[PDB]
Write a protein that binds this ligand. Structure first.
Ligand SMILES: CC(=O)N[C@@H]1[C@@H](O)[C@H](O)[C@@H](CO)O[C@H]1O
Ligand SMILES: CC(=O)N[C@@H]1[C@@H](O)[C@H](O)[C@@H](CO)O[C@H]1O
Ligand SMILES: CC(=O)N[C@@H]1[C@@H](O)[C@H](O)[C@@H](CO)O[C@H]1O
Ligand SMILES: CC(=O)N[C@@H]1[C@@H](O)[C@H](O)[C@@H](CO)O[C@H]1O
Ligand SMILES: *[C@@H]1O[C@H](CO)[C@@H](O)[C@H](O)[C@H]1NC(C)=O
Lengths: 370, 371
């Protein structure tokens, strides 16, 4: 079994903190005082993608594939997802990612981010939301959008859906809200990126008269990066979701070390709050280390991109299977995967604003406190 | 200038006739007048079992490595971004009868003319201010946006439904029944052919949906649409074609086409000529004309997808420019392109259907001329 295991890193625009968390988590793997948990040296090479254009992406992936990495950590967006997942599946190279989980059932993709739709549907049912507005963009896929479409037909809900992903004019959010007032709409599910949630919420405040009596359910695991003090002042209910529990001592002890790190060597660790995607990045390194320690224990053997007679990687299958079978405790709770690399047996914490109102998991569904 | 010019062929699922038309058109270029055939035209074909990005990239690059001077092929909504991206980065001209793209890209010659101008003209000519618009997204969003914009700005009552994902024929019935409750008699259907046939079968089976109804079928594959059962009930049907049967070039092509052996050229005897096989024929005319042009200008023409050194600014530019500047007569009328490889100065024939008369023609300057 090798002395060194090398992994790839594919990073996008605006993943600076995650890059830092990645470098730091690897360093924690390598400086562990316990020799049993560190039987090989963990090493890496990183590429940054200026864009998600298909050529740029393929070039980057193949340069790393050619170096001989044993797995690849990285990010995709709506534009690059299909290229990365397709090359990984064809070349048997496991891609570990904290990006949004895919719609399709693919091989060789470990999705660190749990799905939200189960929790969202449970809370729609628990709050009895049978008439509501659903503002969405497509940047985290279509998974939630379709679950909501299907449930609306099946339950006879009046959902007014509006696709806000392309709006560059903040005045146009106002025109949408004013329209929804004419229909008496007080309940809003907002399935957007964080920055767009903040934009939308600023318009709610500035426009005015849109707090007391209203309820915004924010379907995004980046709850703690959402600026929502101005909306709460008016009296609005807000429901949110998190997967990082701050009272968890593992998170606490990680944070303690994290905030001491130098601004040059590890940017966005002092000056910025910990994003949930940097927590998933930390947990990706736990999962990768655990899988390779497992392979060493099983005594499994491990060792050109655009070949026309493309030769499959023999050992890739064991690496995939090893990553999928890990059970580890991380900053995002219990971490396990099903056969399509999706998180299973996870917990989503539900926040009502500022108490934790309950938790959701796959078996119990939504359990409220009190 | 070389003895042989080689081209690539990228074919997808359900392009068997087009593959035959491609092989046949090349053969007609090569067996011609010595002046119109100063080099031998040669090709290598790959088939894409799927439109997954690796399968597509591997196919494109294998052909790029052989040293082809252009690539003929197809894309779909899934593969468009991969192909247009690799074409632009490697300066390799992609000639295609697939749907024209939304974005303005380089190195892509789009044989299929746009429909939206013609559709909007006929909506205005028939005075359609209240109608249903059933659509899928497989030919791009060009038509969908034109209709959204025109509905706002003309004060139309358009009821739009996106039917691209429906695999349950029962669900088309629920949609039509809903539109009866609003008194809707006029339907614009912007779908693939097979889905148009599905939809139309439901119209018949459901029944009482012909006499006072009007279906405008926004799809150039008009002659593959099964519409006899709908017409018998008395429904008006409007359609569009770009292949004119009275054109002697089409007639003489058909004459030869239907005599071709079933083994060597499948789907030429047993199946009607699809408009995409006509565009495939015209692609070979365009390619031959461009390379004859380059030989006449005395332009020089002669590795690998990973750009270790990379593609210099000046490579493939002559070939791009040559393909874009051709003016030729083909099975689909006058063929010219603008700077983004889009058809310009084209004509669309409009058909009204017992009855089956050509009701008029549409072009960019005159708009719809009714006869
Ligand atoms: C000895 C010590 O302090 N800590 C751990 C021990 O709890 C654990 O069982 C083992 C597994 O790798 O690693 C060591
Ligand atoms: C618009 C809306 O749903 N507002 C909710 C209301 O349903 C609920 O009664 C209350 C908690 O008791 O929080 C608020
Ligand atoms: C996989 C399964 O069926 N049950 C597990 C259980 O073994 C484990 O103790 C717990 C930890 O959160 O998660 C659940
Ligand atoms: C819109 C519709 O359903 N049917 C029209 C009808 O109104 C019109 O009078 C006729 C003229 O030929 O063309 C068809
Ligand atoms: C327009 O196209 C026609 C052929 O259909 C041709 O007679 C004429 O030269 C073209 N004009 C321009 C400006 O391309």
């Amino acid at each position: 079994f090798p002395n060194t295991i090398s992994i790839g890193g594919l990073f996008m625009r605006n993943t600076v903190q995650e890059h830092s968390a990645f470098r730091f988590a690897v360093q924690l793997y390598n400086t562990n005082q316990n020799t049993t948990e560190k039987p090989f040296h963990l090493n890496y090479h990183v590429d940054h993608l200026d864009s998600s254009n298909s050529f740029s992406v393929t070039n980057a992936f193949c340069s790393q594939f050619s170096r001989g990495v044993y797995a690849i950590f990285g990010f995709y967006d709506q534009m690059s997802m299909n290229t990365l997942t397709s090359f990984c599946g064809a070349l048997h190279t496991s891609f570990v990612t904290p990006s949004f989980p895919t719609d399709a059932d693919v091989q060789f993709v470990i999705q660190m981010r749990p799905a939200l739709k189960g929790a969202i549907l449970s809370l729609l049912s628990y709050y009895k939301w049978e008439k509501f507005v659903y503002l969405y963009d497509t940047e985290r896929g279509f998974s939630v959008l379709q679950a909501i479409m299907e449930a609306a037909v099946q339950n006879n809900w009046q959902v007014t859906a509006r696709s806000v992903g392309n709006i560059k004019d903040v005045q146009e959010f106002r025109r949408i809200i004013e329209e929804m007032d004419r229909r008496q709409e007080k309940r809003y599910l907002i399935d957007c990126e964080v920055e767009r949630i903040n934009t939308i919420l600023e318009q709610v405040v500035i426009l005015g008269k849109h707090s007391r009596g209203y309820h915004y359910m924010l379907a995004n695991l980046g709850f703690t990066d959402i600026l929502l003090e101005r909306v709460m002042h008016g009296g609005a209910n807000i429901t949110g979701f998190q997967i990082v529990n701050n009272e968890n001592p593992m998170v606490q002890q990680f944070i303690q070390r994290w905030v001491r790190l130098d601004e040059r060597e590890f940017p966005e660790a002092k000056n910025a709050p910990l994003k949930y995607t940097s927590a998933l990045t930390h947990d990706a390194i736990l999962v990768i280390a655990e899988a390779f320690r497992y392979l060493r224990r099983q005594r499994v053997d491990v060792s050109d991109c655009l070949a026309n007679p493309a030769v499959p990687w023999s050992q890739g299958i064991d690496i995939e299977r090893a990553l999928k079978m890990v059970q580890v405790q991380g900053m995002t709770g219990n971490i396990q995967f099903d056969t399509y690399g999706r998180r299973t047996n996870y917990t989503i914490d539900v926040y009502e604003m500022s108490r934790k109102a309950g938790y959701w998991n796959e078996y119990e569904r939504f359990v409220p406190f009190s």
